[PDB]
Design a protein around this nucleic acid. Sequence first.
RNA 1: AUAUACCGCCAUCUUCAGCAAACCCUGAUGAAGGCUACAAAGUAAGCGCAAGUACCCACGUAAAGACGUUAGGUCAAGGUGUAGCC
Lengths: 50, 132, 38, 217, 87
Amino acid sequence: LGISIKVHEPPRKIERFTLLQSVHIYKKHRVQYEMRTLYRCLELEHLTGS
Amino acid sequence: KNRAARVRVSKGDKPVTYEEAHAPHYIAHRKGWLSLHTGNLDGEDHAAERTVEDVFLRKFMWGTFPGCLADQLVLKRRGNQLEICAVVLRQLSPHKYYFLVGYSETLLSYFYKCPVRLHLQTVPSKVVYKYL
Amino acid sequence: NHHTYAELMQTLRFLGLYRDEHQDFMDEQKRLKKLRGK
Amino acid sequence: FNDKILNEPLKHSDFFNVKELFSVRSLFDARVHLGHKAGCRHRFMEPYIFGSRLDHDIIDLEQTATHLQLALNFTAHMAYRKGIILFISRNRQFSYLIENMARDCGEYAHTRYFRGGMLTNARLLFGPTVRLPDLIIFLHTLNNIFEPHVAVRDAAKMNIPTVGIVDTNCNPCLITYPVPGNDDSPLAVHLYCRLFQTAITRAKEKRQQVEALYRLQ
Amino acid sequence: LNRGQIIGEGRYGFLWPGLNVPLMKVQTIAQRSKEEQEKVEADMIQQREEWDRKKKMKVKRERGWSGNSWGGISLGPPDPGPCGETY
RNA sequence: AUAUACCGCCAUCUUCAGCAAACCCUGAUGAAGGCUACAAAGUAAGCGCAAGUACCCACGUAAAGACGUUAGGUCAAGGUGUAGCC
Ligand SMILES: [Mg+2]
Ligand SMILES: [Mg+2]
Ligand SMILES: [Mg+2]
Ligand SMILES: [Mg+2]
Ligand SMILES: [Mg+2]
Ligand SMILES: [Zn+2]
């Protein structure tokens, strides 16, 4: 559609959190989980409403 | 020893699929997630109520496709469109199979309040990645 | 709501469209407790 | 039906005329008759020994040569009847020579380390459909430490006949066709590979002319 | 131990058109009688006692030199080679 | 009530490298054992370590760590055997 376009990649925010490993005791043993959630910008420029 | 999602080696005669042969430190390293939705990205809400529906649909269909479900399902989610994909064994008659598509499609359409579409796949035997 | 989720699955065993293994595990085990118990 | 050319060369006596590739004189001049010390003789080289000279055991070359009309004849028949012939030694001083002689003829060599269970455990070491050798020819019946080979037992466990060079210290017992002769001498086994090579390739070309004669008649 | 049950039957007696009936020849739901599912319930439970007794069967095992003593009990002939050679 | 019936999730040696099905050999066909590359009977799938990935690299740190031991911890996360109350 001849649309003037650029792309850039915003830096990612990886929001890791921790949890206990056994069901009972042992706070010296954790397992930690993460979300890698990534980004993308689709910076279009100067296009009509239709 | 940590026993979170492994099956344990016993002999040479125990077959196992690709997924449950893989330990949970391979979740995005060697596996895919079994269900796709827009919940855990930040900051998005509706990550919370969906997964207590996500756990029903693989506890619903474990019972309504009984004895024939090959491995776990794939519960894709496209806007207001819940896309269940499933590979199922070739053991039942197909007249039964076509019954519980439209049974479960319009009973899961009228529970989630969305449309739901099923895509079955037929394999003759359970696909085994490891003779452990 | 946990009635909405758990009573619909009660009737869908009653009409037999959903065959669950946990409550099968009771009503066969409860069969073999009432033979002696109770 | 192809049993006309199998049941002639069992009735004929020295059918390949193998009594021309040696006598005692060819065996003397390549030092077959020398054996080791009387210190390390075996018990069962005792018939095959002429005597000791200043304690050096001397091997009966008459009792050698009455074996080799009979030992080279049998390994001719094994080449005639298309059976698998395995050459083994562990000499390390003729180990080039044995394998090179297996290419000069059309049969087999194995002169390297013996993997445990080569004949008694063949079916898992290889595929399940393997034709194991039908005669084994030894050129050193001893091993690189001086005890008899692994494949003198596993030949007899697998019920394979075996012609073997036995020298004054070797064990003649489980191997069916002993050849009481030298094996440590570089002139001796150049001779021994010369008679064993030529006695099978003559025996091969006997097998070629007979079936062709049967192909025409 | 799932063996007895068929995928359409529940003890509210509903004969669905796709399950539990011969295929389409009925395409109408059919709530049964109180007696016919009562007989199916005793068609069910009389079927379960048979595979209960067929579990509880005393096989006339042969007996080598005394019973519960793996003495001169036989086995079968040896299994063949992987390329023929029956025994 | 019983973690001494368990599943589930773990601790721990483990800041290890071994466990091993299926064969074969030695043992006079005894429990058993099986090593020497100038190689003397072992071969091997499978699991683990290793590799590879993640983080900022090959480094390091995580993550990983089989078989088993301590009848280790938990019926009170949730299921659930057996007994027990209604
Ligand atoms: Mg740990
Ligand atoms: Mg008795
Ligand atoms: Mg760690
Ligand atoms: Mg590693
Ligand atoms: Mg305790
Ligand atoms: Zn010698």
